[PDB]
């Protein structure tokens, strides 16, 4: 049997990414471990994103917008990259108010001050408008879990606003690989390498911790009742 405990290092970046590395591992475990972890990183994860989008003037992601340069469809995607976080411990739902003016360059921070919540990426192109350009923007946001297509829930905050694709899955990309190093007369000893890419929200690290703990709790059920 034998074999000692793994060596857990981690070349962090700051907010996104994280090359975590665990070394010592007996054949198989490499995959065993990871894979499922992956299937949790990208799956059930606590996070927030846009759920609805009111835009005073014209309803339809497929219409036209005077005064504006881009078009609804884009503001959408640009709105997704957007990420906000909750300072209130049990308030899974907020409403946001964006105000446009004449000639300017919309920015993610230019969103209704308000204290209770926090804009995490103030800058974002969002939009940009010509001369005298209007853009009220009741953008509804939710406390989600993974990914729920704008075509599964059907949002209903207002009547002329459009629901959207909830990307509230902090875990934006996670890949691994099990190369095998050596430690003695042995050379086929699993060497895992995980890499989780995240938006400025929840650090990749925690991305993991929370994952395990979840997968952990998720084992305590195999108990003996």
């Amino acid at each position: 049997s034998k074999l000692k405990a793994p060596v857990f290092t981690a070349t962090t970046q700051g907010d996104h990414y994280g090359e975590f590395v665990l070394e010592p591992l007996e054949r198989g475990f490499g995959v065993t471990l990871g894979n499922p972890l992956r299937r949790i990183l990208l799956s059930s994860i606590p996070g927030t994103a846009v759920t609805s989008v009111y835009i005073e003037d014209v309803l339809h992601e497929f219409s036209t917008i005077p005064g504006v340069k881009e078009d609804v469809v884009e503001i959408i995607l640009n709105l997704k990259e957007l990420v906000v976080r909750f300072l209130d411990p049990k308030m899974a739902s907020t409403t946001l108010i964006l105000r446009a003016e004449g000639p300017k360059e919309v920015r993610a921070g230019d969103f209704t001050p308000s204290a209770d919540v926090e804009i995490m990426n103030p800058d974002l192109h969002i939009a940009t408008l010509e001369e005298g350009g209007k853009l009220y923007m009741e953008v509804r946001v939710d406390r989600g879990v993974g990914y729920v297509p704008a075509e599964r829930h059907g949002i209903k905050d207002r009547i002329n606003a459009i629901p959207v694709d909830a990307i509230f899955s902090p875990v934006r990309r996670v890949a691994f690989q099990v190369e095998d190093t050596r430690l003695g007369q042995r050379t086929d000893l699993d060497k895992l390498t995980l890499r989780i890419w995240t938006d400025g929200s929840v650090t990749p690290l925690e991305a993991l911790n929370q994952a395990v703990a979840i997968l952990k709790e998720h084992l305590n059920y195999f108990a003996n009742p």
Partner: protein
């Protein structure tokens, strides 16, 4: 298990008694079991008689003769097993009865005169020559007669041919050249053929008669009015240009071979030589090129009817056409029994000149046979045969098949009468004849391809080696039972039909019938039919038949399979292919490596070491079971008990299996569960993945016995003894040599560890450098008697189990010149699989392994059970071996279906018939799953989800069905054990029969940092302690040159080979770690310069300013 058998067409007759080519041929040669007054010639008979009414120089005058009456067969001076452990030729004294009348008379019959050891054959088909067994093979040469054929170095014109049986007559070629003439080539001689027309009684107007008017080539063969003269005169310009050194009128003493009698010229007794030189020639010939002693002179017979088809061939009319020199009706086969008999016309040769010189010097009264003959020329010439001729081959004992495969072989090569290693692009090729006689998919990859090959199953060789293949005769629309074994020349005029063709009850069924004539494939009318083959097996070689779904494999990537199947090595838990072809069992029986019972009785005693029975009141035999004995490749075949200790038997059935056999059926490898697909490039290009699982079950494991030997000689420095006593050896060493020098049996062997001590004196000298740095690696300087014991060569080894001993002097133990006492230790090993080992399917998919993966990986099915081997697809396309894929399908079938099947040659099952069981398996398999309580899950559907978008599945049908639908489609969903998610595409899965081949890395693989430096050439060779010494060729260099690899080149031509300075210098260099080399001036350079002067010529050396060198400093 439970066996179904596909297709009908009931084999009107099982297959030939196989081994017939060696036994049935060798028994009808050495007739020792048939009254001596009888015996209808050939073999030893026609050999003692062709050269026995053996006169004495001077015809009539002084006495002395010596004749024949009958020959006596010997009785084995030894038994099969001893003659083998003792290194004997299992020969058998052969006596002959001589009696020589004098001129004054005397009937002195010297009672049996020993002529020489003639080795007796074995039940097998091989022999026992100086130890091991060899396969006196069967060659195939140009069958006698006359054909002509065109001219090679002169287009448009034609050459004539006169081939009598070989080693019993001269080669004769009547080539007509540009000078107008028609010269005569004979035993390396090209003289005006006009000189041989007059000798046979032809004038200056009958050479113009029968053959002029048409073809004015007779007026070149004509004007030579200086040789168009006299009869006994055109005999001295022929005996003074054919044989120099003697001009007498005794030109009918030599001009007496190449014609009359049968001393030399003659093509069989009137068969191929006459019966052929009659139909195509000018009809009417008996048996020799013309005839002598008729009334006085020579009355020509076959030097004119063939000279009336060669010139009417260089202009001519119809009926007169070239012959095909590679046709079988035009080709022969020299069997075994006769090839030794021809080494008797050679064994009785240097013996008919060992007496005709003994009757000149010795008194002609004091003479009686057994005092005139020495009998050394039949021993030295009939022992020379089973000990050296390129045809007397080792014997592939890998498995039992190969054993037999070997025998079936057909070679072109040969001692004299044969083909060199630089020709044959009009022979090698497969010919419209072979059909049913000589398989076309058995020959070897390259180098030899063609020339060599295996016989076509049913086909038999006969009379004058004419291959004959089985056909079934019809009553023009009806169908007989009678079967027609017939030659080829007997086939070019019949409109034969496939057996594949629909036949009701016992006749013709339908009007669109496929048939062939001569060789051309045409469709024929139901009663426009002559015959019909017995089956297709009749068409392919022996093993080329074991192929399951040959019906669906390229022709090329196929032979590979029939082949390779030969380089097949046995394993323990062997097993016969799930999908067979019948014969599968028989092969095992005709091989004889399996043990059967003559008469039916019942077993009494039964164990690994023996099997005693009590046949039906026929006594109680008790045949032992050869346990773990060595092959010749090494292999290690051993038979095994497969019966109980109480039961009526079945008239001789598996009295116990053999090496790779399972209850009577050939078990080359092991049908296992396969999964066709790509893994992380882990089978890439032609690689294969394995699941640890087999090692677990210890599924693919081979046993192998390496044979080690040693020889102690007699010297001036003293005799080479062998005792368990050798200096400086620390007891913990000798430790396992109870035998007083030999290793005890059951000892665990390692390398370098002792095997056989053996002390020789030698010395008289003092060590010095380049071995006193090593040395202490081989001494501690020394002793008055040195070590030189055996010791295990690097890597090998295993557990002993057998020791043999001899000593110059035992009863039959005969040691060479200088040697005394022999020893041979036998140690073996288990071998399982080792990443890299070689293995493949009969379908020609040879493929080794690179990654044995844990049962945790190993894409498994949905019901838990994982596959075994991942057989990537890629290796199937470019090659056209579908069938293999077809075996896999039947596989999954045979899994859940619990069985075995037999898809014989072009007679196997079918897609519509298979889908049947495949579903028949699914209904079962799944009945198992829903029965448990489940029924497909997200993983599966998701597949089927796309399985349809892909159109393999019929859309609009329950998930469940999309499964069956698909299942029956031979594939299914597969889970990648690593990630819960299954593969996203149904996967073809099933049980695929495979094998383990001769090659097994274990025997390859090496590496040498330093070690054994030769003393001859001055470089790395052999290897006593550490081993190996890799080579390096031009190519290597050139490319090396390719890159500006300067040093990489130079360091590759010095300190790694000759330049003694360096290698040590260098060798040292690292021991300390310095730059290391920089050799002064490469050895060889100096060497040569010196090998030069060592043959005159200074061979100086200058620079850029042209000045004296200093190339040797010593």
């Amino acid at each position: 298990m439970e066996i179904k058998r596909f297709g009908r067409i009931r084999e009107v007759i099982p297959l030939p008694p196989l081994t017939e080519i060696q036994v049935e041929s060798y028994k009808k040669a050495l007739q020792a079991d048939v009254p001596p007054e009888k015996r209808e010639n050939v073999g030893i008979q026609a050999a003692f008689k062709e050269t026995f009414p053996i006169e004495e120089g001077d015809k009539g005058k002084g006495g002395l003769v010596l004749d024949f009456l009958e020959y006596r067969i010997g009785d084995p001076p030894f038994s099969q097993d001893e003659c083998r452990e003792k290194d004997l030729t299992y020969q058998a004294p052969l006596y002959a009865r001589l009696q020589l009348i004098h001129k004054d008379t005397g009937l002195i019959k010297e009672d049996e005169v020993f002529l020489g050891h003639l080795p007796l054959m074995t039940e097998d088909g091989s022999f026992i020559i100086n130890g091991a067994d060899r396969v006196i093979v069967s060659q195939i040469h140009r069958s006698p007669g006359v054909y002509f054929t065109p001219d090679p170095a002169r287009p448009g014109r034609y050459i004539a041919s006169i081939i009598p049986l070989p080693k019993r007559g001269p080669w004769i070629d009547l080539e007509v050249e540009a000078s107008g003439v028609v010269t005569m080539k004979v035993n390396k001689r090209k003289f005006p053929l006009v000189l041989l027309l007059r000798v046979l009684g032809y004038d200056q107007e009958t050479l113009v008669r029968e053959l002029s008017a048409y073809g004015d080539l007779v007026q070149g063969l004509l004007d030579e009015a200086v040789l168009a003269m006299r009869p006994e005169e055109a005999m001295v310009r022929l005996f003074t240009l054919l044989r120099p050194g003697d001009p007498p009128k005794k030109d009918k003493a030599l001009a007496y071979l190449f014609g009359l009698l049968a001393d030399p010229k003659r093509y069989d007794l009137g068969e191929a030589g006459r019966y052929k030189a009659e139909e195509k020639l000018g009809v009417g010939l008996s048996g020799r090129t013309l005839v002598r002693f008729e009334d006085g002179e020579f009355k020509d017979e076959v030097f004119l009817p063939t000279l009336r088809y060669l010139f009417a061939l260089t202009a001519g009319v119809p009926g007169h056409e070239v012959d095909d020199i590679d046709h079988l009706g035009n080709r022969r086969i020299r069997t075994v029994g006769e090839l030794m008999a021809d080494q008797f016309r050679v064994g009785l040769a240097r013996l008919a000149r060992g007496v005709r010189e003994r009757m000149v010097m010795g008194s002609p009264d004091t003479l009686t046979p057994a005092k005139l003959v020495n009998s050394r020329p039949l021993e030295a010439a009939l022992r020379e045969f089973f000990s050296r001729s390129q045809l007397s081959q080792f014997k592939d004992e890998t498995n039992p098949l190969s054993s037999l495969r070997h025998k079936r072989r057909i070679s072109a090569l040969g001692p004299g009468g044969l083909t060199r290693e630089r020709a044959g692009f009009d022979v090698r090729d497969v010919h419209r004849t072979h059909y049913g006689r000589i398989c076309p998919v058995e020959t070897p990859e390259g180098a030899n391809i063609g020339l060599i090959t295996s016989l076509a199953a049913y086909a038999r060789v006969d009379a004058l080696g004419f291959i004959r293949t089985p056909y079934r005769r019809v009553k023009n629309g009806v169908v007989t039972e009678e079967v027609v074994y017939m030659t080829a020349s007997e086939e070019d005029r019949y409109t034969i039909a496939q057996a594949n063709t629909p036949l009701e009850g016992d006749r013709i069924a339908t009007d669109r019938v496929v048939a062939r004539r001569r060789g051309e494939p045409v469709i024929v009318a139901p009663e426009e039919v002559e015959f019909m083959d017995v089956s297709p097996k009749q068409v392919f070689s022996l093993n080329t038949n074991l192929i399951p779904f040959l019906e669906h494999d390229d022709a090329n990537r196929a032979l590979m399979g029939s082949n390779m199947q030969t380089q097949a090595v046995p394993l323990i838990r062997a097993q016969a292919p799930v999908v067979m072809t019948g014969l599968e069992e028989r092969v095992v029986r005709d091989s004889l490596a399996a043990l059967y019972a003559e008469e039916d009785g019942e077993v009494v005693k039964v164990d690994g070491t023996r099997i005693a029975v009590r046949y039906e009141d026929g006594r109680l035999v008790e045949h032992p079971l050869r346990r773990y004995a060595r092959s010749n490749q090494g292999t290690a075949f051993d038979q095994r008990p497969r019966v109980r200790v109480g039961q009526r038997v079945k008239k001789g059935d598996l009295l116990a299996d053999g090496p790779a056999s399972e209850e009577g059926f050939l078990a080359l490898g092991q049908n296992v569960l396969v999964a066709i697909m790509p893994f992380d490039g882990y089978n890439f290009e032609d690689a294969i993945v394995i699941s640890e699982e087999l090692l677990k079950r210890d599924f693919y494991t081979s046993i192998h016995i390496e044979r080690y030997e040693i020889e102690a000689r007699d010297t001036k420095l003293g005799p080479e003894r062998i005792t368990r006593d050798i200096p400086h050896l620390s007891e913990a060493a000798l430790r396992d040599l109870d035998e007083e020098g030999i290793v005890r049996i059951g000892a665990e062997v390692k390398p370098g560890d002792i095997l056989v001590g053996r002390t020789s004196f030698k010395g008289e000298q003092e060590p010095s450098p380049e071995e006193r740095l090593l040395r202490s690696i081989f001494g501690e300087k020394a002793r008055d008697v040195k070590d030189t014991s055996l010791r295990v060569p690097p890597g090998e080894g295993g557990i002993v189990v057998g020791r043999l001993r001899l000593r110059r002097g035992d009863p039959g133990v005969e040691l060479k010149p200088g040697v005394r006492e022999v020893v041979r230790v036998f140690v073996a090993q288990k071998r399982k699989l080792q990443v890299g080992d070689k293995l493949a399917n009969r379908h020609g998919n040879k493929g080794v392994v690179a990654k044995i993966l844990p049962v945790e990986d190993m894409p498994h099915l949905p019901d838990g059970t994982p596959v075994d081997v991942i057989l990537n697809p890629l290796g199937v396309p470019s090659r056209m071996n579908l069938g293999q894929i077809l075996e896999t399908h039947l596989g999954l079938a045979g899994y859940f279906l619990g069985q075995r099947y037999i898809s014989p040659v072009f007679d196997g099952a079918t897609e519509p018939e298979i889908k049947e069981l495949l579903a028949e398996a699914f209904n079962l398999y799944f009945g198992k799953r829903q029965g448990e309580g489940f029924g497909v899950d997200k993983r599966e559907k998701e597949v089927l989800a796309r399985a349809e978008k892909l159109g393999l599945v019929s859309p609009g049908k329950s998930p469940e069905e999309q499964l069956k639908e698909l299942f029956d489609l031979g594939k299914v969903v597969l889970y990648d054990g690593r990630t819960g998610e299954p593969f996203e595409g149904p996967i073809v899965v099933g049980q695929m029969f495979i094998m383990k081949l001769y090659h097994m890395v274990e025997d390859k693989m090496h590496a040498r940092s330093t070690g054994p430096y030769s003393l001859i050439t001055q470089q790395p060779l052999g290897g006593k302690a550490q081993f190996g010494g890799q080579r390096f060729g031009e190519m290597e260099v050139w490319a090396l040159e390719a890159y500006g690899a300067a040093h990489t080149l130079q360091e590759m031509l010095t300190i790694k080979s000759d330049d003694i300075e360096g290698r040590n210098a260098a060798y040292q260099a690292i021991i300390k770690g310095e730059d290391v080399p920089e050799p002064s001036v490469p050895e060889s350079f100096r060497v040569l310069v010196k090998e030069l002067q060592a043959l005159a010529l200074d061979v100086q050396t200058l620079d850029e300013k042209d000045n004296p060198v200093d190339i040797f400093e010593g």
